[PDB]
Amino acid sequence: ETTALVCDNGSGLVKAGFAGDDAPRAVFPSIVGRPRHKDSYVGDEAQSKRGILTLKYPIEHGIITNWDDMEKIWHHTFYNELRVAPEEHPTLLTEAPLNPKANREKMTQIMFETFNVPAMYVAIQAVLSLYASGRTTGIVLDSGDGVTHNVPIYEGYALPHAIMRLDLAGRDLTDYLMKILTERGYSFVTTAEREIVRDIKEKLCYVALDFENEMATAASSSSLEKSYELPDGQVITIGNERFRCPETLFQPSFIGMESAGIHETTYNSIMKCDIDIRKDLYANNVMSGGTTMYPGIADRMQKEITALAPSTMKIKIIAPPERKYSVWIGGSILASLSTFQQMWITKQEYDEAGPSIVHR
Amino acid sequence: ETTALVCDNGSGLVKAGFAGDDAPRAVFPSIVGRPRHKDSYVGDEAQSKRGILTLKYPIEHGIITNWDDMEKIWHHTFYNELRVAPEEHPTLLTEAPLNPKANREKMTQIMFETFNVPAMYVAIQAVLSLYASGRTTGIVLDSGDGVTHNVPIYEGYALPHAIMRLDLAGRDLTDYLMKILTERGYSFVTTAEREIVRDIKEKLCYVALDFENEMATAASSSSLEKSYELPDGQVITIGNERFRCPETLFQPSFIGMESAGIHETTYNSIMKCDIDIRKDLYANNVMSGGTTMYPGIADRMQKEITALAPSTMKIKIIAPPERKYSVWIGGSILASLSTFQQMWITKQEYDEAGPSIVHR
Ligand SMILES: CO[C@H]([C@H](C)/C=C/N(C)CO)[C@@H](C)C(=O)CC[C@H](C)[C@H](C[C@@H]1OC(=O)C[C@@H](OC(N)O)C[C@H](C)C[C@H](O)[C@H](C)[C@@H](OC)c2coc(n2)-c2coc(n2)-c2coc(n2)/C=C/C[C@H](OC)[C@H]1C)OC
Ligand SMILES: CO[C@H]([C@H](C)/C=C/N(C)CO)[C@@H](C)C(=O)CC[C@H](C)[C@H](C[C@@H]1OC(=O)C[C@@H](OC(N)O)C[C@H](C)C[C@H](O)[C@H](C)[C@@H](OC)c2coc(n2)-c2coc(n2)-c2coc(n2)/C=C/C[C@H](OC)[C@H]1C)OC
Ligand SMILES: Nc1ncnc2c1ncn2[C@@H]1O[C@H](COP(=O)(O)OP(=O)(O)OP(=O)(O)O)[C@@H](O)[C@H]1O
Ligand SMILES: Nc1ncnc2c1ncn2[C@@H]1O[C@H](COP(=O)(O)OP(=O)(O)OP(=O)(O)O)[C@@H](O)[C@H]1O
Ligand SMILES: [Ca+2]
Ligand SMILES: [Ca+2]
């Protein structure tokens, strides 16, 4: 009878819609603009007025850090993007792996006390992605605009002790591509120019199967070169930039980070898990998030994990075509399930206990 | 107190000696002979017994590809050419640009585990050549018997993203000269006959300043003709063959290759480098390797880069007279430097970590 809302709060993009739908109805930037001199603006409007506004990202590395601006994002999501009255819909919110308890309580408080929701729930993003692939056991690589995680999941639940995190994602890859092209004589600095580079990244970048062979090919021929036309009609051609950019995921030292690459964090996560469930994890590597959209990434992961894993182990990388929205879809499904309707944290329950009722 | 060894492993010739000396004491062919029916032979001995041996080149296009035969080359280098005991000398080895990491680890393993060296180091050949010219910033064209590279170098370090490679060098030029003379009625096929053509190439070939004017001169007069006496007393005269041969460096289509010429790869390398350091690269083009020994090559490069580069740019091609051995000399110097003695990878360090300690 009543429709649940699903809201996936990302570092770069907010994905929102109605439980049961196959895609989010709303997808907009996680930005809040406030007049340097309406007291606030959200998303594309905030960016269109950037010349007179101070732009802020309320979610950093997947964690909400500015609560006033986050209320404005949720307000815009409910009233403008979805045109619902939040007091009439159970609302499923998503959170990043390793989100502090206090942070989850604050989300719970805002939903109940500011938006007056009748019931709500907070789910881990990576766990939702797994569900969206039809599995309750597996290991997810979730890479977005702000953070990357490996989350091993067993019988529906994440194993927090074996979660690995890499503070490097899409925004950093875009920054790196901006920096490379700029050194080459072009100038990509403004936010307008950042949107151009983001588009170049999404359209022309790919993950090399063998980075070293690819660099050799690029050095000895132009067979890997692609051309991109800028808005002013000017043309820019890239070669090894196409794959050096996402290679950073596997070699964080490319941007001065000492961290392990996504292939190593994947193997390390599995290796922190119970020896008796590793077989199932190796066989169920699910990729999720926009930064896993690079052509070649699955084959490259397959190759890297195979080299680290014992020789007899069956390795399988699942990379669904709708993985830009896997998290949201996982939430739409869960929130639709008959079994799940007893899991909602009700307003009455919140009024009874405190925000600490939310800890699952 | 202890003398370091320098060993420069080329596709055609091995150059080896002692750090501090002004030239390699040993220079011999990179060949290993194994009896079709001593289990092995190296260099000039292998070639003298070619009629009953299978000859193999363990380094192809500057990259080591046969490790068993390479051990034999190093063994011969240490024990026979230099008459040293490798366990008493730090040893500096050279590698080609874009050498795979795994390849460098295998060299490291052999040096420590098979020859028991006390300490060693692997340096990029082109970078050494630059050092031998008294510079830590510049762009080197390195052309030998098996491969050609452009390596831009800034404050002592190669910029791997802007390295260009041309899979064409001296061996291919010799092959081309063999093929041309053979079509002309002569027969140059055997390895003995290849040595004759190599000698003709080295003695009589040159790079034309203007290829098209030179072809016209050759067509309308005999003023460019030179005569060469074969071992049997027979005389062969060449005209446009003298400069058509090395022209291949600038026009790879002469041997059916779609690749860019050495002038284009030079400009392209500079253009992949930071715009703010190009001025310094244009002003510091160093030539290195035997295939850069052709009379006329510097003036021709000067002319070609000038035509591609912006009109106000100062272009300078440095072609040292000892450039057959620039790489080795650069290594002799580095390995002698007081500053460099802390850079050696020690046996203890190798025993501590793995072969991966070698990545500079
Ligand atoms: C009750 O929740 C518990 C536990 C209490 C919670 C724990 N946490 C929250 C934890 O941390 C939890 C362990 C649990 O059971 C999770 C169950 C998962 C959500 C999930 C459930 C199953 O759910 C699933 O297995 C999901 C898969 O469905 C099937 N049949 O395989 C998804 C497909 C692989 C791909 C999509 O179809 C594809 C992406 C696309 O298809 C066009 C699609 C787009 O939107 C949707 N599908 C969609 C939107 O809503 C729905 N689908 C939907 C709503 O109901 C259904 N689908 C129904 C079918 C029933 C499924 O049976 C196969 C369903 C049982 O299991 C993988
Ligand atoms: C410490 O190494 C770092 C870094 C850690 C390493 C990085 N990589 C390895 C990187 O990828 C690196 C950045 C670095 O500093 C490189 C330094 C270079 C090797 C080089 C060093 C200089 O070294 C140089 O600048 C080299 C030049 O010397 C001078 N004075 O100009 C060479 C001449 C131009 C030509 C030769 O004289 C000529 C070919 C011939 O002369 C008859 C000759 C033949 O053999 C030799 N010379 C010879 C053999 O050993 C030596 N010379 C020798 C040993 O010590 C010296 N020379 C000494 C003089 C000191 C130089 O000062 C001018 C010396 C400081 O700089 C161009
Ligand atoms: N085809 C593509 N190729 C590469 N990257 C892409 C592609 N499409 C989108 N992206 C990148 O994915 C990111 C958005 O993904 P997503 O919406 O999953 O992240 P998010 O949830 O906002 O951030 P996070 O999960 O880090 O908090 C952006 O950085 C975007 O540039
Ligand atoms: N005077 C000369 N003119 C032209 N070519 C020459 C001359 N002297 C030597 N060569 C050529 O240079 C090559 C040897 O140069 P070098 O020793 O620098 O190469 P390498 O290091 O063995 O090979 P690579 O660097 O490709 O692995 C041979 O092909 C030889 O014919
Ligand atoms: Ca996300
Ligand atoms: Ca060489």
XYZ file of N, CA, C and O in Angstrom, chain A residues 182-185 212 215-221 225 237-241 244 251, chain B residues 98-102 160-166 259 271-276 278:
160
model
N 47.281 19.069 -18.495
C 47.764 20.434 -18.268
C 49.275 20.547 -18.474
O 49.753 21.505 -19.072
N 50.023 19.570 -17.978
C 51.462 19.549 -18.177
C 51.784 19.470 -19.668
O 52.778 20.030 -20.137
N 50.911 18.801 -20.409
C 51.057 18.654 -21.849
C 50.763 19.918 -22.679
O 50.837 19.873 -23.906
N 50.440 21.032 -22.021
C 50.254 22.310 -22.711
C 48.840 22.843 -22.639
O 48.606 24.039 -22.802
N 52.579 -2.758 -18.598
C 53.905 -2.620 -19.205
C 53.916 -2.873 -20.716
O 54.631 -2.181 -21.433
N 52.231 0.244 -22.333
C 53.153 1.381 -22.391
C 54.118 1.229 -23.562
O 54.412 2.202 -24.248
N 54.596 0.006 -23.786
C 55.477 -0.317 -24.915
C 54.777 -0.100 -26.264
O 55.361 0.479 -27.174
N 53.529 -0.555 -26.380
C 52.738 -0.352 -27.599
C 52.557 1.136 -27.865
O 52.767 1.596 -28.990
N 52.175 1.876 -26.822
C 51.979 3.337 -26.916
C 53.256 4.076 -27.315
O 53.193 5.092 -27.988
N 54.409 3.556 -26.905
C 55.695 4.170 -27.216
C 56.165 3.883 -28.648
O 56.954 4.638 -29.225
N 55.682 2.790 -29.226
C 56.157 2.350 -30.536
C 55.144 2.474 -31.673
O 55.467 2.175 -32.815
N 53.930 2.915 -31.368
C 52.917 3.148 -32.398
C 51.813 4.043 -31.868
O 51.702 4.265 -30.667
N 45.904 5.583 -29.863
C 45.509 6.984 -29.777
C 44.036 7.223 -30.105
O 43.488 6.618 -31.023
N 44.368 14.888 -28.522
C 44.549 13.457 -28.749
C 45.283 12.862 -27.558
O 46.259 13.437 -27.114
N 44.819 11.727 -27.032
C 45.529 11.050 -25.930
C 45.906 9.610 -26.296
O 45.197 8.954 -27.056
N 47.035 9.144 -25.762
C 47.531 7.790 -26.002
C 47.619 7.027 -24.694
O 46.605 6.520 -24.210
N 48.814 6.968 -24.100
C 48.979 6.280 -22.819
C 48.227 6.932 -21.647
O 48.036 6.292 -20.614
N 47.771 8.178 -21.807
C 46.953 8.811 -20.774
C 45.664 8.013 -20.569
O 45.162 7.905 -19.455
N 46.932 5.063 -18.299
C 47.741 5.445 -17.129
C 46.833 5.983 -16.026
O 47.104 5.808 -14.842
N 47.954 1.011 -8.996
C 49.226 1.572 -8.516
C 49.020 2.993 -7.974
O 49.236 3.992 -8.691
N 61.978 0.926 -20.698
C 60.744 0.141 -20.704
C 60.974 -1.362 -20.453
O 60.179 -2.201 -20.866
N 62.058 -1.692 -19.764
C 62.346 -3.070 -19.371
C 61.324 -3.463 -18.302
O 61.168 -2.742 -17.319
N 60.596 -4.578 -18.498
C 59.614 -4.999 -17.476
C 60.221 -5.180 -16.075
O 61.352 -5.643 -15.944
N 59.475 -4.814 -15.039
C 59.933 -5.028 -13.669
C 60.420 -6.471 -13.418
O 61.497 -6.678 -12.844
N 59.637 -7.456 -13.862
C 59.974 -8.873 -13.671
C 61.348 -9.216 -14.251
O 62.091 -10.029 -13.704
N 59.425 8.025 -17.899
C 58.970 6.854 -18.664
C 57.738 7.071 -19.548
O 57.669 6.481 -20.621
N 56.805 7.932 -19.143
C 55.603 8.180 -19.965
C 55.894 8.796 -21.353
O 55.078 8.675 -22.269
N 57.029 9.465 -21.506
C 57.361 10.142 -22.772
C 58.447 9.428 -23.587
O 58.950 9.978 -24.572
N 58.812 8.215 -23.173
C 59.781 7.404 -23.907
C 59.120 6.892 -25.183
O 57.990 6.402 -25.154
N 59.821 7.037 -26.302
C 59.374 6.510 -27.593
C 60.349 5.431 -28.031
O 61.544 5.504 -27.724
N 59.830 4.439 -28.748
C 60.614 3.298 -29.206
C 60.398 3.010 -30.693
O 59.282 3.070 -31.192
N 61.483 2.679 -31.382
C 61.455 2.322 -32.794
C 62.177 0.978 -32.888
O 63.362 0.903 -32.588
N 55.957 2.750 -38.760
C 56.439 3.625 -37.694
C 56.966 5.005 -38.096
O 57.314 5.277 -39.249
N 57.267 16.490 -26.951
C 55.888 16.998 -26.878
C 55.016 16.288 -25.848
O 53.977 16.826 -25.436
N 55.419 15.085 -25.444
C 54.741 14.411 -24.341
C 55.258 14.884 -22.982
O 54.642 14.603 -21.958
N 56.366 15.618 -22.971
C 56.936 16.123 -21.714
C 56.311 17.429 -21.287
O 55.739 18.141 -22.104
N 56.445 17.741 -19.999
C 55.923 18.985 -19.435
C 56.327 20.148 -20.324
O 57.485 20.286 -20.684
N 55.361 20.986 -20.673
C 55.610 22.145 -21.519
C 56.748 23.029 -20.965
O 57.515 23.617 -21.733
N 56.866 23.093 -19.637
C 57.850 23.956 -18.977
C 59.294 23.450 -19.029
O 60.195 24.187 -18.662
N 60.444 21.649 -22.006
C 60.755 21.359 -23.414
C 61.942 22.167 -23.948
O 62.758 21.647 -24.718
